[PDB]
């Protein structure tokens, strides 16, 4: 906040939605609750300058959980390689993954 009246006046106006690990209705946790919880607990009061260099892997795990960028990339490679291998005829899916 530019002029932090919420901190001074000691009431909440929007510091209840700004994060995913806040008190959600009926304690419905978000997808990446644990990932961001570690990240915020990591860089709390340390400052933005120190946060961007020290709490880096915690952010990367959290940002990955948000998008699954690498995990979906891993799945994309599994399916593509499986497709060409099955199409050529080296190996066929086992009966558990048919029914």
């Amino acid at each position: 906040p530019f002029f932090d009246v919420q901190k001074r006046l000691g009431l909440d106006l929007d510091r209840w939605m700004t994060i995913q690990s806040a008190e959600q209705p009926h304690k419905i946790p978000g997808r990446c609750h644990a990932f961001e919880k570690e990240w915020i607990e990591c860089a709390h009061g340390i400052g933005g300058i120190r946060a961007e260099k020290e709490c880096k892997i915690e952010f990367d795990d959290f940002v990955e959980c948000l998008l699954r960028q690498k995990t979906m990339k891993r799945l994309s490679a599994i399916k593509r390689q499986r497709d060409k291998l099955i199409k050529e005829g080296k190996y066929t899916p086992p009966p558990h993954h048919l029914g």
């Binding site: 209705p25 960028q69 979906m72």
Partner: protein, 175 residues
């Protein structure tokens, strides 16, 4: 074929989006928005957002109705334009269809699109999450908390809309 309707629905959303962005006659622009708006409601419904999907359906329909209700009121052309009509709108239209159809071709043939951000084609069904929701729909309880957790948002939204009626009369009054 029912592989994942998300892309198909979003494609019609873009083609409908292309339409009124090409500057037709305003009434035909309403149709181009409505198809995108209707299918956009379909996209959100498919993602679990049942309430929000029909929500944008009801509000927009009323919103765009007064839009082209106005165009025939005082913005109508004595000879209205059409999707073909002038070469400018024709050029603006066909440009949009060939554009989007190029990106989707660019999208579905390598699955590693890197325009601006990263876009990999693997299926929007994947990003879904495994887990129950108890006996409540998550979206409905989230927008229900507006009256319990969002009392600040209600005040600013209510006051702005009340001011919204004041400006509308004050602007339109004149003299």
């Amino acid at each position: 074929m029912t592989m994942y309707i998300a892309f198909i629905l979003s494609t019609i959303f873009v083609i409908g989006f292309v339409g009124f962005s090409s500057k037709p006659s305003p009434i035909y622009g309403g149709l181009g928005l409505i198809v995108s708006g209707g299918v956009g409601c379909g996209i959100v419904l498919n993602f679990g957002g049942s309430f929000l999907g029909l929500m944008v359906f009801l509000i927009y329909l009323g919103g765009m109705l007064v839009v082209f209700g106005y165009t025939t009121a005082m913005a109508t052309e004595m000879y209205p334009e059409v999707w073909v009509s002038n070469k400018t709108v024709f050029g603006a239209f066909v440009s949009g269809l060939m554009m989007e159809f190029c990106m989707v071709y660019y999208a579905l043939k390598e699955e590693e699109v890197e325009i601006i951000f990263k876009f990999n084609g693997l299926g929007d069904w994947v990003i879904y999450d495994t887990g129950d929701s108890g006996f409540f729909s998550e979206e409905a309880m989230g927008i229900a908390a507006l009256y319990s957790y969002g009392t600040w948002l209600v005040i600013v939204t209510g006051w702005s809309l009340l001011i919204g009626v004041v400006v509308i009369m004050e602007i339109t009054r004149g003299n």
